[PDB]
Amino acid sequence: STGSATTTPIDSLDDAYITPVQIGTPAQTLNLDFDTGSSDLWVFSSETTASEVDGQTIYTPSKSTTAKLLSGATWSISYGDGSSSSGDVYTDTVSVGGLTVTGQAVESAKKVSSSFTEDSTIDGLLGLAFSTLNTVSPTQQKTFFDNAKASLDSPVFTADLGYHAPGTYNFGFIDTTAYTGSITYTAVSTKQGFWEWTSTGYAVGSGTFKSTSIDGIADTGTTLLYLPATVVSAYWAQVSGAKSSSSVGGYVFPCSATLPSFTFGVGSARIVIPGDYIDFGPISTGSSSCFGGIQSSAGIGINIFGDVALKAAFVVFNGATTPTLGFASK
Numbered sequence: 001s002t003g004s005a006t007t008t009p010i011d012s013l014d015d016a017y018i019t020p021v022q023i024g025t026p027a028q029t030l031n032l033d034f035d036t037g038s039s040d041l042w043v044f045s046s047e048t049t050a051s052e053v054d055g056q057t058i059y060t061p062s063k064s065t066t067a068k069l070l071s072g073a074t075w076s077i078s079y080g081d082g083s084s085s086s087g088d089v090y091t092d093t094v095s096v097g098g099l100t101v102t103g104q105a106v107e108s109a110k111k112v113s114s115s116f117t118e119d120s121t122i123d124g125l126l127g128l129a130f131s132t133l134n135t136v137s138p139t140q141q142k143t144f145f146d147n148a149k150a151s152l153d154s155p156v157f158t159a160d161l162g163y164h165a166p167g168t169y170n171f172g173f174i175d176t177t178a179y180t181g182s183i184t185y186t187a188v189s190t191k192q193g194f195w196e197w198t199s200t201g202y203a204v205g206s207g208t209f210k211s212t213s214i215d216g217i218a219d220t221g222t223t224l225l226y227l228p229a230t231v232v233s234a235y236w237a238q239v240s241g242a243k244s245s246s247s248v249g250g251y252v253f254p255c256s257a258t259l260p261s262f263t264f265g266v267g268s269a270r271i272v273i274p275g276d277y278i279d280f281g282p283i284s285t286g287s288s289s290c291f292g293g294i295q296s297s298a299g300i301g302i303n304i305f306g307d308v309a310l311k312a313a314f315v316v317f318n319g320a321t322t323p324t325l326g327f328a329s330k
């Protein structure tokens, strides 16, 4: 089997991407944020604290003939940015782009943090990291990919995020028309439950490539690119007037700037992030200070190859017995 679904930016800045997901019988379609940095499929629901719902589409398990309460199971997740959600669990039928899993754990939110409440376009998250991170207690549950894996033509999914444009998540196959050149595969460590790999280095604009190992995670659920302070300083030093602002919470730059590209290494291959991808617009409405799309990972504790990096590539998440990651230009 295979699946193929279009993913769409939630706003003009590509702050996140949502993908329609069918849950239950008859189908209830919710737009979920596919997140390769977590492993819970959770949704706004009929059980979510009313004051914490602001425009989201909700899953109502009582209206699904295939929904079954998973007796005694609860979940609670804290994301590294400070966001959180929690609740109880159903199993139900879940389909993505024509690919169907029966008995998928669907985690029904009773509580969500303000950040989720304020994101009216995101109806929940669909985790695509390793199932070892799943928060369901007392019986840990599998991700949608882990459940689907055996039935897939090939045990893979691919992320093809668009810059200010729709993109695609495919399951079970690699669309060879979707990229240029060849896909370069690189080793993955699953020790922290993430799609963790090591970049071979970086370049700023037309500058010379610096060979240096950068360990980080491929995370579709994170907007920006978070890298060591040394690397990020070298990037912003090429932008006149750029500076790190504690009051703003990162590097900002004059909106009148033309940003240089940023290149990252995958083995001997190179992925180029165009300068425009790194512009996240005015810090507040009408401001001439703009927020940078490359930020320091210092104090996060891990480097994060978020959407800013991933959307510059066609990315293969290979879930074979020994997982690997592939990157191609496009």
Ligand SMILES: Cc1cc(C)c(/C=N/NC(=O)[C@@H](N)Cc2c[nH]c3ccccc23)c(C)c1
Binding pocket: 016, 033, 035, 036, 037, 038, 079, 080, 081, 083, 115, 119, 122, 219, 220, 221, 222, 299, 300
């Ligand atoms: C200080 C800091 C700041 C950020 C932005 C992150 C990223 N976190 N990103 C994630 O955890 C995502 N994989 C999922 C996610 C967290 N919060 C969200 C809000 C909306 C949509 C997705 C997420 C971290 C780890 C630390």
